[PDB]
Design a protein around this ligand. Structure first.
Ligand code: CA
Ligand code: CA
Ligand code: MG
Ligand code: MG
Length: 236
């Protein structure tokens, strides 16, 4: 398997509050986080999420990989608590929060557990078709699930769930089986606010994952780059 990861402040934002991690040693897990909060809170929250999820997975993967749902829930909860602790004792950053999307590959490497909180996304690509795997935790997406139909709504990026909340009430986890040649994309909404799924799907057809990741980021910026943008591209 081949993997590439890139983050970029974009063309507008003063600082980058996205973060990511790739397990380059064993290629077992991959993490993207999109932080929010003034007074540099967003940067702290996304960094905490990535570091705490990584550390939890590194520490507990051997013991728990037979129960990936429990493992991933506990990793996210560790991140959540770490952010809340810093809130509780950091008045200026009391509202900091972050999304996270995580892929954990099983040992064989052909099943991906997809875990998330927020509106960063995981997609799977296969033979020029693209499928969004995660369901955005936004009020606007929830409505679309129910009886109202959003891509232009001014509040589309308003989150209904986020790490950094004592009242975190949902961690979505589901497995996806993989075939050779599939690709997986983890991305912050800095990508999807600029590029339609059709466009994303084309860049993911680029044989070289290094180039595909660079192309997605460059395209997001060419289209406006109004937000921080982060991608991790995995080729199965
Ligand atoms: Ca952000
Ligand atoms: Ca964002
Ligand atoms: Mg097969
Ligand atoms: Mg644009």
């Amino acid at each position: 398997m081949d993997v590439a990861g890139l983050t970029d402040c974009g063309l507008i934002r003063k600082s980058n509050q996205d973060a990511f991690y790739i397990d380059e040693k064993h290629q077992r897990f991959f993490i993207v986080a999109d932080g929010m909060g003034g007074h540099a809170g967003g940067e702290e929250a996304s960094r905490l999420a990535v570091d705490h999820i990584r550390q939890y997975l590194e520490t507990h993967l051997e013991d728990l990989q037979h129960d990936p749902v429990t493992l991933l829930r506990q990793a996210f909860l560790a991140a959540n608590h770490a952010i809340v602790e810093q809130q509780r004792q950091n008045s200026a950053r009391a509202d900091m929060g972050t999304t996270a999307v995580v892929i954990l590959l099983d040992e064989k490497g052909d099943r991906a557990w997809c875990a998330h909180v927020g509106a960063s996304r995981i997609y799977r690509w296969r033979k020029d078709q693209l499928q969004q795997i995660t369901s955005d935790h936004t009020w606007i997406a929830q409505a679309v699930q129910l009886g109202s139909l959003a891509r232009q709504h001014p509040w589309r990026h308003v989150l209904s769930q986020c790490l950094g909340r004592e009242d975190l009430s949902q961690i979505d986890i589901q497995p996806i089986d993989l075939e050779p040649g599939d690709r997986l994309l983890l991305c912050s909404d800095g990508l999807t606010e600029e590029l339609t799924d059709d466009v994303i799907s084309i860049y993911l057809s680029e044989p070289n994952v290094q180039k595909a990741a660079a192309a997605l980021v460059d395209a997001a910026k060419t289209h406006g780059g109004r937000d921080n943008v982060t991608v991790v591209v995995i080729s199965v």
